[PDB]
Design a protein around this ligand. Structure first.
Ligand SMILES: CCCCCCCC/C=C\CCCCCCCC(=O)O[C@H](COC(=O)CCCCCCCCCCCCCCC)COP(=O)(O)O
Ligand SMILES: CCCCCCCC/C=C\CCCCCCCC(=O)O[C@H](COC(=O)CCCCCCCCCCCCCCC)COP(=O)(O)O
Ligand SMILES: CCCCC/C=C/C/C=C/C/C=C/C/C=C/CCCC(=O)O
Ligand SMILES: CCCCC/C=C/C/C=C/C/C=C/C/C=C/CCCC(=O)O
Ligand SMILES: CCCCC/C=C/C/C=C/CCCCCCCC(=O)O
Ligand SMILES: CCCCC/C=C/C/C=C/CCCCCCCC(=O)O
Ligand SMILES: [K+]
Ligand SMILES: [K+]
Ligand SMILES: [K+]
Ligand SMILES: [K+]
Lengths: 287, 287
């Protein structure tokens, strides 16, 4: 039964239901995957706290106050090991780069009322500009791929909007580009930041996808070797990876929309008895 | 001078330069705004650490080790005050919701190799699906606004793709909707989480814009009053706010593209001597 509703509303409802099921399944998987590690780490921390309390003769009240003070310090940008100044010009540049790309690592956060108000306004404008930049970069990359494909075809036969690349081809190119960027960034990060290669790849995916957990943040140590060049390389790699991964997300979203249309059509056609865009859309008028 | 380059490449270059200038200016403003508060907080932490070291007769080595252990505990999900289980089913649902929407608060992060691999794959697929969902929601809201405007016009004259709303109107509706959602969410959060109203508004903007700093995370205390209803309300409000703010970002990006075209045209026309989309684009072919 079609349900006397249009195709688009059915697509919206199906996508919402699928996302809810995906969230439930992912939550179950993650819990079953690392609840034990959580509990072990908590028990280890409790053992360490008890040992420290016994070994230096302090109750839990003074230790609680000290830990609260240290939490305030960390929120202010203090770490046990050496860390770069949090709100110098370079640190502020890192912070605004994280805000502008909606990454938000969290190592640098505003702590003043004026700071937070300016964060709101600046983030609004900059995030809009950055989404526009990502869309423009995706369009430019698609045009480049089309031009290169045309040139290669003309060279092959000798030996633009006409023959444009398909969605699958662009998705494959974006996938391999993201893999290469992540591999190079991890190759740089592993011997510099001291992380493992897998940890570097995980951080690369976290930063590129604009998730920005904040557990791993690059270029945060107080001093580096060739510090300016390292910072420039880190910025370039993060920007390139974020652009590539965002374009990949958009292309996979197009593919998922195609798949959603297909499954909706199949269910409407022969699965009922078997129980047992905005640019040409909203920008077009304002022109 | 046009520079014998097409309009789109010039638009890309101008946007990149403007974003670089915006980043530099924002970094300067943020640094000048809160470097003093940073330094004051750091000095306060140093004073507190020295006082604690003097008052209980411990050197800096044992305190350094204790603070490193506490940092590991916090990375494991331990706080000085009571906090909910980090990787139970509800906590895992919160985590996957943060990952799927690219918010990434950071209070819950994977700590196992399999956890990180599944995070990579699940985040890829879910973020693609969620970007598609946000685009579909924006299209549906635009259609709803068009239908409502048609009905209101027909009622007014009595007393669809034809008369569609413009970009300015949709932007204004999205702005007021985001303001209302943020106000309601702050009204709920202020007496529950204990934050100030301005802090609640700041957290609302941070979460809605998918920045997710992680300094403020809602529904993290161990126990609440009507805990299930509160969690449901928090989820609904965060989802609605994220959708609205993302749509607002896209609309403002369209407006910024219009402005960029205008400034490029003006500079090409009469400012030289004065010195002193993807859907109809890439999805169209694959259909
Ligand atoms: C949460 C996830 C929401 C979306 C994922 C669930 C459904 C996706 C798999 C659909 C099952 C088969 C449908 C299918 O063949 O998709 C076809 C192509 O789509 C795909 O290959 C799978 C979708 C991409 C998945 C990520 C890569 C549609 O093309 P066509 O009609 O021309 O054959
Ligand atoms: C980093 C920021 C990058 C973009 C911001 C810098 C330039 C934006 C302001 C442009 C200065 C005036 C241009 C202008 O009038 O924009 C006009 C409308 O755009 C605007 O109102 C300003 C842009 C929106 C800004 C955020 C809201 C273009 O429309 P029209 O041609 O029909 O008159
Ligand atoms: C940034 C996106 C691109 C990511 C490209 C790489 C992602 C794939 C994951 C790499 C494999 C990691 C090997 C680490 C060793 C763990 C043992 C095998 C665990 C398993 O396999 O069960
Ligand atoms: C989520 C996006 C919508 C946000 C809507 C509200 C944002 C505007 C900011 C609200 C004003 C905050 C008042 C706090 C009191 C500070 C004194 C004035 C500081 C100043 O003004 O210099
Ligand atoms: C081509 C110019 C850039 C235009 C688009 C910019 C938007 C994307 C920038 C996001 C960068 C995120 C992290 C940057 C950290 C570098 C700071 C440093 O360690 O020094
Ligand atoms: C209409 C169904 C949803 C479909 C789209 C879902 C994508 C957006 C969801 C992001 C939610 C972010 C935070 C959720 C935290 C709630 C967890 C809890 O405190 O319990
Ligand atoms: K984020
Ligand atoms: K974060
Ligand atoms: K984040
Ligand atoms: K984000």
């Amino acid at each position: 039964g079609p349900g006397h509703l249009n195709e688009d509303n059915a697509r919206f409802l199906l996508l919402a239901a699928l996302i809810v099921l995906y969230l439930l399944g992912g939550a179950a998987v993650f819990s079953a995957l690392e609840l034990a590690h959580e509990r072990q780490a908590k028990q280890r921390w409790e053992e360490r706290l008890a040992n420290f309390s016994r070994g230096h003769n302090l109750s839990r009240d003074e230790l609680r106050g000290f830990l609260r003070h240290y939490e305030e310090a960390t929120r202010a940008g203090i770490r046990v090991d050496n860390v770069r100044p949090r709100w110098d010009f370079t640190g502020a540049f890192y912070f605004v780069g994280t805000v502008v790309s909606t990454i938000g690592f969290g190592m640098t956060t505003p702590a003043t009322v004026g700071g937070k108000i300016f964060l709101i306004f600046y983030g609004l404008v900059g995030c809009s500009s950055t989404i526009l930049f990502f869309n423009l970069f995706l369009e430019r990359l698609i045009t480049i791929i089309a031009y290169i494909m045309k040139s290669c075809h003309q060279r092959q036969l000798r030996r633009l909007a006409g023959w444009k690349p398909s969605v699958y081809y662009v998705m494959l190119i974006l996938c391999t580009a993201s893999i290469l960027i992540s591999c190079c960034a991890s190759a740089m990060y592993t011997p510099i930041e001291g992380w493992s290669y897998f940890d570097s790849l995980y951080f690369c995916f976290v930063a590129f996808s604009t998730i920005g957990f904040g557990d791993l943040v690059s270029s945060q140590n107080a001093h580096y070797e060739s510090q300016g060049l390292y910072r420039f390389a880190n910025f370039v790699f993060i920007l390139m990876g974020v652009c590539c991964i965002y374009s990949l997300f958009n292309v996979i979203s197009i593919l998922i929309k195609q798949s959603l249309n297909w499954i909706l059509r199949k269910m409407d056609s022969g699965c009922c008895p078997q129980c047992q865009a905005f640019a040409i859309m909203n920008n077009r008028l304002a022109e």
